[PDB]
Amino acid sequence: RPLTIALVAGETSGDILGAGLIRALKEHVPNARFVGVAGPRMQAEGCEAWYEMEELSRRSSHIRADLTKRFGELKPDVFVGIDAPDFNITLEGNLKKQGIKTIHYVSPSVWAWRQKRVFKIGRATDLVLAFLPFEKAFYDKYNVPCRFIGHTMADAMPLDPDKNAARDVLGIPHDAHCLALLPGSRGAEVESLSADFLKTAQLLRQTYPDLEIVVPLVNAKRREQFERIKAEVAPDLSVHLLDGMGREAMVASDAALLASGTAALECMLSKCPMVVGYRMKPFTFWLAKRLVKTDYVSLPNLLAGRELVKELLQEECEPQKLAAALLPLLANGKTSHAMHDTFRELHQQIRCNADEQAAQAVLELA
Amino acid sequence: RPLTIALVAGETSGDILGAGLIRALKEHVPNARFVGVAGPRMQAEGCEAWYEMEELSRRSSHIRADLTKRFGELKPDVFVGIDAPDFNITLEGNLKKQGIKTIHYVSPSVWAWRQKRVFKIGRATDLVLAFLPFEKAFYDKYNVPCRFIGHTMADAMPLDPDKNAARDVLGIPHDAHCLALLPGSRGAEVESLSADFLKTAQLLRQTYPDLEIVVPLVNAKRREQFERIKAEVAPDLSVHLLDGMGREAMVASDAALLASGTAALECMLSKCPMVVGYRMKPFTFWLAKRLVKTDYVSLPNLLAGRELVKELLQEECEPQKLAAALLPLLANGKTSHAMHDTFRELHQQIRCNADEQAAQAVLELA
Numbered sequence: 001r002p003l004t005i006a007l008v009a010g011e012t013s014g015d016i017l018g019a020g021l022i023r024a025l026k027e028h029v030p031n032a033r034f035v036g037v038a039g040p041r042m043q044a045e046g047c048e049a050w051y052e053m054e055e056l057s058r059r060s061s062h063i064r065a066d067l068t069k070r071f072g073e074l075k076p077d078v079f080v081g082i083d084a085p086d087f088n089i090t091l092e093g094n095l096k097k098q099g100i101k102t103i104h105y106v107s108p109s110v111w112a113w114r115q116k117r118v119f120k121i122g123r124a125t126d127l128v129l130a131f132l133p134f135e136k137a138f139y140d141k142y143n144v145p146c147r148f149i150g151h152t153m154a155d156a157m158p159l160d161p162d163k164n165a166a167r168d169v170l171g172i173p174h175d176a177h178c179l180a181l182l183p184g185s186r187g188a189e190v191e192s193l194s195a196d197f198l199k200t201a202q203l204l205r206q207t208y209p210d211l212e213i214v215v216p217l218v219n220a221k222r223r224e225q226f227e228r229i230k231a232e233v234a235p236d237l238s239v240h241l242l243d244g245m246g247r248e249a250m251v252a253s254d255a256a257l258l259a260s261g262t263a264a265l266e267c268m269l270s271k272c273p274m275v276v277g278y279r280m281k282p283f284t285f286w287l288a289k290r291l292v293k294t295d296y297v298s299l300p301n302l303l304a305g306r307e308l309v310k311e312l313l314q315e316e317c318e319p320q321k322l323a324a325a326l327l328p329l330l331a332n333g334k335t336s337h338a339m340h341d342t343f344r345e346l347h348q349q350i351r352c353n354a355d356e357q358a359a360q361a362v363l364e365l366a
Numbered sequence: 367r368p369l370t371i372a373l374v375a376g377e378t379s380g381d382i383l384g385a386g387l388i389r390a391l392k393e394h395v396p397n398a399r400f401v402g403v404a405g406p407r408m409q410a411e412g413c414e415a416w417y418e419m420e421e422l423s424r425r426s427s428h429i430r431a432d433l434t435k436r437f438g439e440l441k442p443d444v445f446v447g448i449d450a451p452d453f454n455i456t457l458e459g460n461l462k463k464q465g466i467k468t469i470h471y472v473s474p475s476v477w478a479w480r481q482k483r484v485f486k487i488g489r490a491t492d493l494v495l496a497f498l499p500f501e502k503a504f505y506d507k508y509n510v511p512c513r514f515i516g517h518t519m520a521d522a523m524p525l526d527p528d529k530n531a532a533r534d535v536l537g538i539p540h541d542a543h544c545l546a547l548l549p550g551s552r553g554a555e556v557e558s559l560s561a562d563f564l565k566t567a568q569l570l571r572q573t574y575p576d577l578e579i580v581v582p583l584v585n586a587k588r589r590e591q592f593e594r595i596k597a598e599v600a601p602d603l604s605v606h607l608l609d610g611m612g613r614e615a616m617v618a619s620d621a622a623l624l625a626s627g628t629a630a631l632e633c634m635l636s637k638c639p640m641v642v643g644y645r646m647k648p649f650t651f652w653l654a655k656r657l658v659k660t661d662y663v664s665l666p667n668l669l670a671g672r673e674l675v676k677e678l679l680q681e682e683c684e685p686q687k688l689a690a691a692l693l694p695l696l697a698n699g700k701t702s703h704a705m706h707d708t709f710r711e712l713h714q715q716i717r718c719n720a721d722e723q724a725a726q727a728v729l730e731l732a
């Protein structure tokens with residue numbers, strides 16, 4: 001049987017990676033066969049599309065079950081889960097259980113929000129392909145086979161971009177200073193940063209009165225959001241509102257002000273000096289930092305030094321798991337009595353007559 | 367001169383702490399004088415109100431400037447900043463510069479989101495008053511004088527609450543199992559958790575068909591938000607919607623399902639077994655964890671291993687600071703050229719022909 005590769009892509013970015021992977025493999029094995037969940041680019045390269053990438057939830061669970069069986073029957077030489085970790089990691093695990101060799105393409109950095117998920121990746125995969133070196137170093141800490149392959153955007157973007165050519169595309173004068181404002185691809189980011197970014201540009205106009213200001217907006221919604229904010233904050237500030245074209249804007253500009261994330265890497269490859277501005281809910285940042293630091297989020301467990309009360313976070317905060325955790329407690333029996341007694345002990349440990357303690361602290365210092 | 371204490375409270379919770387502190391001090395010094403920013407409870411105990419607590423932004427900056435001068439003239443024996451860290455920490459610093467002894471009451475855990483702010487607290491204060499032991503242990507790590515005084519809520523809540531009395535207040539039958547649902551005091555929490563909490567209760571009704579469900583809602587907005595979600599998720603689930611009364615609901619219930627935060631402590635003091643459910647943006651949790659782990663958030667600095675590009679986060683993401691950071695870059699001179707060359711070096715380090723690397727990884731495993 002000729003080399004047969006199973007692929008699953010779940011988004012346009014993954015379809016691009018998959019098509020590039022197919023082309024490179026056909027160079028070494030022109031007879032290779034490719035099947036799975038394919039977008040139009042993978043299909044154009046010959047990927048058999050059992051399902052369309054756009055089809056990636058009830059339906060998703062059904063597809064993953066079907067692929068688990070079919071890939072099980074097929075026994076492909078390798079399975080490559082292309083990104084889409086919420087779908088592919090579990091699938092990679094199901095196939096590894098059947099002895100099939102699995103690769104996960106792209107570090108699921110956001111998805112792997114806790115140690116337990118790193119171990120899930122390692123158990124589900126024979127190898128992880130990581131774009132960046134510090135991602136490989138991360139998995140090195142866990143004896144998880146990971147190969148640093150470089151970043152495809154670095155292959156696609158030249159070392160020395162043409163600033164003047166980008167300015168010609170955007171109609172930006174070559175003699176003017178030019179500032180790129182990337183308020184973010186997410187609504188939360190745009191809402192948090194757009195006003196401050198506009199005020200920043202207003203301040204800079206005081207020094208550079210002919211400063212060109214280009215604003216690449218990823219989609220119509222984010223655009224309408226930005227115009228709304230601008231109308232209330234800086235109605236008289238003339239700017240270039242662009243539909244996409246963030247790459248052109250950054251290659252063209254002399255500096256960029258970015259929310260953060262993928263833009264900062266693309267900006268680096270554009271050779272545009274940048275300043276990164278970001279703002280997040282302080283309350284949740286504290287919770288996260290609390291968790292990273294202790295594995296807990298709730299005060300009873302911090303006071304007890306153990307998982308005294310059950311904490312179900314993120315994907316574990318789900319009805320079935322919540323109900324299973326509450327059922328022993330609603331029984332109002334032995335378990336509830338033991339938690340009751342520990343609660344009384346901790347209550348006593350922090351019952352100190354704080355008003356008097358504070359009053360004494362004042363009097364000592366005085 | 368009789369003992370003279372300066373106090374600043376900025377919210378109702380701080381007014382309660384301040385009034386309790388005033389009463390305890392008057393026990394030891396009935397002639398003591400109290401002045402500053404006082405709510406109605408502090409005033410009732412005799413606190414001279416130079417400003418009303420409700421007045422705590424342009425106006426806030428003006429008040430803090432005025433208090434910096436006046437407290438400077440007064441030279442109070444002690445200044446106590448009662449919570450409100452965004453106002454009081456800077457004020458405590460201004461007064462310490464004048465030799466005045468300062469105490470900050472209540473650990474500013476959320477406000478102190480990074481090391482630099484812990485050092486700010488230590489420089490601004492002679493002592494921090496912390497409700498909880500792990501908060502004191504935190505400041506012990508930084509040689510920041512901190513006194514663990516216990517939690518005032520533990521003083522106010524009895525060790526053995528009366529479940530049946532709370533049920534009588536709420537009209538809950540004594541023979542029924544009762545579940546408290548606290549979907550959160552913030553709109554983001556209610557939106558994220560209300561549906562899953564309702565579905566959880568629906569599942570539990572399958573085992574406890576007479577289960578009472580009490581939902582304490584902090585305000586009318588959060589209430590309207592919850593009813594809206596319930597109308598779409600569980601219109602036929604009968605529940606008790608309460609205006610506040612979270613304490614009564616928890617003392618009364620046999621178990622509680624809580625978003626998290628202050629509720630979990632109050633639930634512990636209510637002797638109600640609990641399950642903590644929480645959900646936050648994965649993307650921002652990763653950023654935070656990224657920062658906690660490295661001090662950076664942007665990919666260029668992670669690749670460089672230093673602050674190659676300026677990152678201005680949270681309170682530093684402000685127009686004046688953003689503009690000052692962009693001005694050297696817009697100059698498009700020596701600095702921009704050095705960042706350009708480093709960008710080209712990092713670009714080369716991750717330009718590896720990833721498609722071919724990935725293809726080779728597949729072929730090896732096959």
Ligand SMILES: O=c1ccn([C@@H]2O[C@H](COP(=O)(O)OP(=O)(O)O)[C@@H](O)[C@H]2O)c(=O)[nH]1
Nearest residue numbers: 182183184185216217218246261262263266
């Ligand atoms: O304010 C902005 C923020 C981002 N982008 C562009 O949007 C693309 C995708 O950004 P995203 O944050 O969505 O990266 P992802 O999460 O998809 O990897 C990037 O090429 C950016 O250049 C933009 O045009 N304006």
Ligand SMILES: O=c1ccn([C@@H]2O[C@H](COP(=O)(O)OP(=O)(O)O)[C@@H](O)[C@H]2O)c(=O)[nH]1
Nearest residue numbers: 548549550551582583584612627628629632
């Ligand atoms: O879904 C909820 C969540 C909280 N609370 C109550 O709201 C009070 C204040 O909660 P918060 O989270 O605002 O604590 P804070 O941040 O003010 O310290 C607490 O006593 C809780 O019992 C409630 O009644 N329903």
